[PDB]
Design a protein around this ligand. Structure first.
Ligand SMILES: Oc1cc(O)cc(/C=C/c2ccc(O)cc2O)c1
Ligand SMILES: Oc1cc(O)cc(/C=C/c2ccc(O)cc2O)c1
Ligand SMILES: Oc1cc(O)cc(/C=C/c2ccc(O)cc2O)c1
Ligand SMILES: Oc1cc(O)cc(/C=C/c2ccc(O)cc2O)c1
Ligand code: NA
Ligand code: NA
Ligand code: NA
Ligand code: NA
Lengths: 116, 116, 116, 116
């Protein structure tokens, strides 16, 4: 799994389940092209977004729909989404885990990058 | 101050000085219109971005050039930038402080929203 | 200010007001000796904890009563308290700002250390 | 696994490997009794600290030796350790994952609490 996203809920102390996210890749004309999308599982994880062959060098954006998550819990949050923009694979293939820890007015995000 | 941004360095335990950022506002066609910009002071703060009259309801994006900050310290960071996307002023004017705490592979952000 | 503590609420997007904390200093027998205390102001800040002359080399512990803060909001939090343990003044006086960003099941803390 | 701890490195974008930690439980006389200890694996995880039978209701403290971790990388960090103090199992048995995201002058920590 070259790209995995894990989302945690800092209010409830749980994985953030059924969180939608969209991945984009910067095109040659500097526009954001749709790349992949999905929803987190009961473990707060989204696996299977891409493959080694498809996940080429580039600038990628993961846009996590935190707003819908909070609104479904009756909370009016601050952010429209949490987004993570990064260059991937520019020194050869790597495995990326993007983690996001969510609160209504705050988020933290980190990356774990491993060389297979 | 209708909109202030404060940036902190989690590696050195200091304000993040001379950090550049642009602020955009979403246009009716979903493109990002230039709205404000600047760089952080020696206190890690950027004041004077906008005025109360100009800062009306909209979706705003603060795009913080964290990559240039880390590169100046000889550190190859994960993110291209840190971005904070939020609706502002939908219930009339508020004062917004956006804080960002930076590490090479991670950032945390929070908002303090106060009614004038 | 030799030692200041700032506390933020990640659920409500506000300073964390009226948050109680005690500061201890490690004694020669490894017990924690009372050193300072107070509660945060309407700005979420606690100033005036110590003076430069009294604040010498030692291991200090700031114990922030986050549990009482969340319980006052009807929220059952995870932590008994947030604690920040650090050596201070080992290279002579410095000014320390300890910031804590609170959620019910999570907290983040950072330090800003400045040379007078 | 009733208690698991996961530690991540925000500077290097990696699991925090070989991080020592000590777990204590508050005794009837309000002292901290040694409860368990171990070191994180190559995945940054420490499993097997305790068992369902041993992990009774109580106040627990996880003290993560972040100082030695940073010093081994040539970094003089701010904190002596990162500590997590919490009541466990007071409504019946739960499974706890404690996560900590480490930087030299900052740490974030969260808990995921699940009912088996
Ligand atoms: O506490 C810490 C930890 C750590 O990993 C690095 C530093 C200092 C970094 C640094 C790099 C380049 C430069 O021109 C100046 C600097 O201070 C301080
Ligand atoms: O943006 C958010 C999110 C969220 O989950 C809760 C709040 C407000 C909480 C609250 C609770 C008790 C009280 O007396 C006052 C309060 O404001 C605001
Ligand atoms: O651990 C963390 C995470 C994070 O996202 C922010 C902070 C501190 C933010 C901050 C905001 C306003 C202000 O006047 C001062 C501040 O330090 C601390
Ligand atoms: O306090 C924080 C802040 C933050 O941004 C992330 C975490 C947890 C991240 C995480 C990453 C990979 C994984 O397999 C599991 C995880 O829990 C904890
Ligand atoms: Na290359
Ligand atoms: Na409105
Ligand atoms: Na010294
Ligand atoms: Na009980």
């Amino acid at each position: 799994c070259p790209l995995m996203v894990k989302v945690l809920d800092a209010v409830r102390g749980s994985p953030a389940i059924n969180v939608a996210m969209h991945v984009f890749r910067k095109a040659a004309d500097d526009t954001w092209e749709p790349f992949a999308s999905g929803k987190t599982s009961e473990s707060g994880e989204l696996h299977g977004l891409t493959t080694e062959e498809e996940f080429v060098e580039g600038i990628y954006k993961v846009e996590i729909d935190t707003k819908s998550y909070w609104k479904a819990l009756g909370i009016s949050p601050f952010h429209e989404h949490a987004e993570v923009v990064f260059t991937a694979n520019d020194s050869g293939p790597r495995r990326y885990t993007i983690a996001a820890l969510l609160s209504p007015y705050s988020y933290s995000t980190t990356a774990v990058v491993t060389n297979p």
